Amino acid sequence: GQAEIKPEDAPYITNAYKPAYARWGFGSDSVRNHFIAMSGEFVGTFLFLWSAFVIAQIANQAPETPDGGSNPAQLIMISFGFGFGVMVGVFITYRVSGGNLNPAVTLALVLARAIPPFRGILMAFTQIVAGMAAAGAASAMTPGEIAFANALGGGASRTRGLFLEAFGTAILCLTVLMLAVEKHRATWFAPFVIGIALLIAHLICIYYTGAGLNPARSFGPAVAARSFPNYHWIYWLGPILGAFLAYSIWQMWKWLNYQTTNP
Amino acid sequence: GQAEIKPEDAPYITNAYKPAYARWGFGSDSVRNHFIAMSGEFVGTFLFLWSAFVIAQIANQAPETPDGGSNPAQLIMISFGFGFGVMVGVFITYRVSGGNLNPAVTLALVLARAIPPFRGILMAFTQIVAGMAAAGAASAMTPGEIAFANALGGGASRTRGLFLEAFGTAILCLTVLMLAVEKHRATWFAPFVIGIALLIAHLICIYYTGAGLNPARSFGPAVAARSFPNYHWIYWLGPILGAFLAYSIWQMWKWLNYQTTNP
Amino acid sequence: GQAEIKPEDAPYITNAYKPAYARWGFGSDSVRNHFIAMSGEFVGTFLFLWSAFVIAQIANQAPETPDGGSNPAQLIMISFGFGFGVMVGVFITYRVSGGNLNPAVTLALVLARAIPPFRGILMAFTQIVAGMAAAGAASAMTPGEIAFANALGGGASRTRGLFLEAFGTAILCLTVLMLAVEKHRATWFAPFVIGIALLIAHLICIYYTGAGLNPARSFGPAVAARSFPNYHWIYWLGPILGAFLAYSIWQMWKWLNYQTTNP
Amino acid sequence: GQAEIKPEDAPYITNAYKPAYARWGFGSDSVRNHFIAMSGEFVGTFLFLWSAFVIAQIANQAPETPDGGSNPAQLIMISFGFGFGVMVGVFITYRVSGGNLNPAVTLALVLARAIPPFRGILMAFTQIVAGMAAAGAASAMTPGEIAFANALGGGASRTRGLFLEAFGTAILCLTVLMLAVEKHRATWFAPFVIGIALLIAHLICIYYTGAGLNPARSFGPAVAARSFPNYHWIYWLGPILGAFLAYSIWQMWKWLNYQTTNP
């Protein structure tokens, strides 16, 4: 009753589809390995954010909805751009850099000791530069005024926006921790779940905050539009708080040895 | 022709991605294990319902549709909030508590003897408290009046609503039973199927009942809005009936040894 | 480098998630086995079609679009009802009956010799009765006039409708053949692909034919509405032609030994 | 702790779900093998493009949006037609031809040495003929004027359109390279990721270029409509550039041995 694997098919079994950070042990601090990680974060973050910025630009050409009302089809389109955009970016870059594509995700993983702080800083810087590049490219490639920068809307206060951003980011980061960082039969599938988490977080946040959820996503368009709202700090503090919340929950479960009935 | 697994990749094979209730055997009645299960249900139910409540709040800011007509884009958005919200919550909590996130699901699994009654009661209480917390948080975080409480609509009577709720909940619970409780090559993927089942059940029910499908989902917003419709009982009895219907079907298939041609 | 499976996790490996028809060999002609197959087709077809009929009823309460124009959000909602409805029904019933849920799918599989003709006839009859029951239940549970019966629309002729139905059904049936009937590493996932195929086929057909794609889906509502259009035959002949087309393509690939470079 | 596979279930393990091009080694240049590859590309490309063309025809019957504005629901519908259409086509044809369904994808894979140039030319010709057939069939099967041919819109210049097409096609091709060509535990799932990549690329491009992303998709409708815009070259050069960009990135990662910490 033994599984029978033809030799030409062995790669599909032996080559695990696991995030790169799972295997960043001894040897990882070479310039080559730092470059590989940066290149994955750059390519992935650029393709994800560029895509999503153009999609948001288009969605924001819909006729205005009166009286500040919502436009569900518009919100769905934008959420697809970010959620499916990140899904594709993470699937592409999973074995290159792990596909964080988001400084807040990288922060959660530094807290969790999945990524060391220096590598994490390199990745976060790379993501922010990629988001600047993506914003510049999306602006150059589309007519009219930039429509993909984050802003408060829907009657939301800054305080409400901060909490929406924090809890939305926590959902994203907890997904990464429980599906990608934790090692199990579903780790390979984490990019899908991560994308759906981001899709949800956009349905929560776009109407009220524009959905930052990702300092690199918020910073780049502000640079390209040459304008920072005074409440721009919510797009930094909110995701940071969410990363700490997700980490906190994960850490509690780790100290409980959650996955094992009788440790 | 033997599969070849590098030692660093063994966790992805050896660590099954299975619901926690699959492995609640001897040792499960410790305070630690009860706490783990409650913490999974609390975190998962809170994140799922909070998300979905905010999404519903936003969707319900769309301009009114005349003459009681439906708004497909709005209904899709709300169904995504609940369906993808539960999907993410279940994927996160699958190995913590099994991700029931719904007293009716827990009831079906108690009937099926997948979860013992006392643990099931603890989980159900936890879900109801999480739904209260989620409703309070979603209300606090959003402007205007609560728009995520369940109500009859679309010309539906209470009796029609009861049956819609029951059959929708039965689809959800039968999905959990056949994909998560039954052990097979697709058990790991059950959270996806569960989410799509809930998405469908929302497309069936939102227009007519608001889509309860989950006593914890219905109770929390009623508390936060300080108002219970007199027909609130449909949001309890309907899901209970659906859990019994799903259990009944599963039990018939179990007594038939459905999966085996020659038992 | 050997895979290491804890005994409690062996069921997730040993219990293949495969369509029931894969394992209908000697012993299958018992009354028990016929009943199991019928019960899977009944439960699955009922839940799928009932769901989708209610969803279509609701979607068809949207305000009318002028000048016979299309309503993309409405079409998406209906396609989700059928596509995700069948996905859930097939995942639930895959190991019970194989989840055909459609006489045309059963016909394709009888042609392919995956299901014997007598069992296939039993399954097809069961599906048609389930569709009658689903139509009656959906009608009873919803106010107003039935809005889920198939009709020509969008300026389509009967001849155009026949071809749309045939090619849409062929996509569905070829998906079942190549993903579920053919045995490989992705067979477990066929219910997902089948659902997306049906979703596509609805986006092709609803506007023009109402999207039959399934004689059981078309017949039941006609009975419940007590009215058969004179062109009702397109909802039988079209899917039959599609089943033969899909079978034909599959059969060509089988005689070519498609999957093997050097047979 | 050894995995235990019943003999009747061995096919689901032993028969890898891998693109046909993975196994085009010695023996592949027979007429039989060329025919198999062409037949997969023809069937897959026809079903994908025919589906998507009819869906686009229908979506383009929505009432016009004033002032050149976007229609998110319409754009979502069209993107589903192409994205889910390609997903189904690739899943069906993965083990027949690999499911390229797109001359630009085939070009990327010829550059990557996954497919030899002569076979690649045969596949590309087949795709273009299939797209002609699909356009003719979709036109014949639908009333009114063809509405599925590519055109600039949304205020986009040809230069902007060229870049949108190139970067969108690069996302698609990089997905194919990293998920299908690279051999790992997720290769079987590549058809899903490919479909989502195409879905994203449509949300980026439809409003501005009509979304070519695929010379076979653009050429066929131009033939059927008997009209080529003078900027039709963007639908060739853009996807070609995108294929080269994707190849370039992949090639850099291959020379870095990206997947291995210590080569």
Ligand SMILES: CCCCCCCCO[C@@H]1O[C@H](CO)[C@@H](O)[C@H](O)[C@H]1O
């Ligand atoms: C002399 C003390 C240590 C020698 C160098 C050890 C290098 C270990 O390197 C690690 O090997 C693992 C496989 O075992 C891989 O999964 C990791 O990617 C790699 O970082």
Ligand SMILES: CCCCCCCCO[C@@H]1O[C@H](CO)[C@@H](O)[C@H](O)[C@H]1O
């Ligand atoms: C990442 C590289 C993206 C290059 C996109 C360049 C597209 C330039 O596009 C041009 O922009 C001008 C305004 O700047 C318009 O006047 C032109 O009509 C438009 O073609």
Ligand SMILES: CCCCCCCCO[C@@H]1O[C@H](CO)[C@@H](O)[C@H](O)[C@H]1O
């Ligand atoms: C032999 C005397 C010891 C008495 C302690 C009974 C503790 C029962 O509790 C058990 O403790 C185990 C750790 O000891 C855990 O692994 C189990 O999960 C827990 O149920």
Ligand SMILES: CCCCCCCCO[C@@H]1O[C@H](CO)[C@@H](O)[C@H](O)[C@H]1O
């Ligand atoms: C003295 C009589 C019984 C001794 C204690 C038995 C504890 C069994 O404990 C069970 O072990 C299984 C693995 O075998 C795990 O899968 C379960 O999670 C665990 O509950």
Ligand SMILES: CCCCCCCCO[C@@H]1O[C@H](CO)[C@@H](O)[C@H](O)[C@H]1O
């Ligand atoms: C789970 C914790 C959620 C905390 C959210 C608190 C957000 C409070 O938000 C405040 O609500 C007031 C009305 O109550 C408004 O007047 C303020 O403008 C708004 O900022």
Ligand SMILES: CCCCCCCCO[C@@H]1O[C@H](CO)[C@@H](O)[C@H](O)[C@H]1O
């Ligand atoms: C040797 C005399 C016994 C005659 C009974 C013939 C029953 C044939 O029926 C078989 O019965 C088996 C159980 O017996 C089941 O496992 C099979 O599914 C069923 O087909």
Ligand SMILES: CCCCCCCCO[C@@H]1O[C@H](CO)[C@@H](O)[C@H](O)[C@H]1O
């Ligand atoms: C006396 C001549 C034949 C004896 C009865 C053979 C019954 C075979 O039965 C078949 O066994 C397979 C496993 O081998 C199962 O996968 C099938 O479900 C079952 O139909």
Ligand SMILES: CCCCCCCCO[C@@H]1O[C@H](CO)[C@@H](O)[C@H](O)[C@H]1O
């Ligand atoms: C499968 C069983 C479904 C039972 C649904 C029965 C719902 C009956 O519903 C009733 O229908 C009457 C019209 O017939 C209306 O007058 C009532 O107001 C409505 O409650």
Ligand SMILES: CCCCCCCCO[C@@H]1O[C@H](CO)[C@@H](O)[C@H](O)[C@H]1O
């Ligand atoms: C030794 C003389 C025989 C000459 C025939 C050369 C045929 C080469 O063709 C090969 O034929 C094989 C079957 O024979 C197939 O399996 C291969 O796919 C095909 O490439």
Ligand SMILES: CCCCCCCCO[C@@H]1O[C@H](CO)[C@@H](O)[C@H](O)[C@H]1O
């Ligand atoms: C005489 C020199 C070579 C003899 C013919 C070798 C044919 C190899 O053929 C290859 O075999 C692989 C399995 O090993 C398959 O995966 C490939 O599909 C096939 O192309």
Ligand SMILES: CCCCCCCCO[C@@H]1O[C@H](CO)[C@@H](O)[C@H](O)[C@H]1O
């Ligand atoms: C791939 C084969 C598709 C065959 C579709 C043929 C459908 C022909 O359809 C006919 O087209 C005529 C205009 O040409 C209309 O006048 C007819 O009313 C319509 O039935």
Ligand SMILES: CCCCCCCCO[C@@H]1O[C@H](CO)[C@@H](O)[C@H](O)[C@H]1O
């Ligand atoms: C023994 C003297 C050699 C000194 C070189 C130290 C290089 C450390 O760097 C290591 O180089 C290895 C290749 O050599 C790579 O596989 C590792 O990824 C890299 O970290």
Ligand SMILES: [Cl-]
């Ligand atoms: Cl404030």
Ligand SMILES: [Cl-]
């Ligand atoms: Cl899998």
Ligand SMILES: [Cl-]
């Ligand atoms: Cl401020």
Ligand SMILES: [Cl-]
């Ligand atoms: Cl009533």
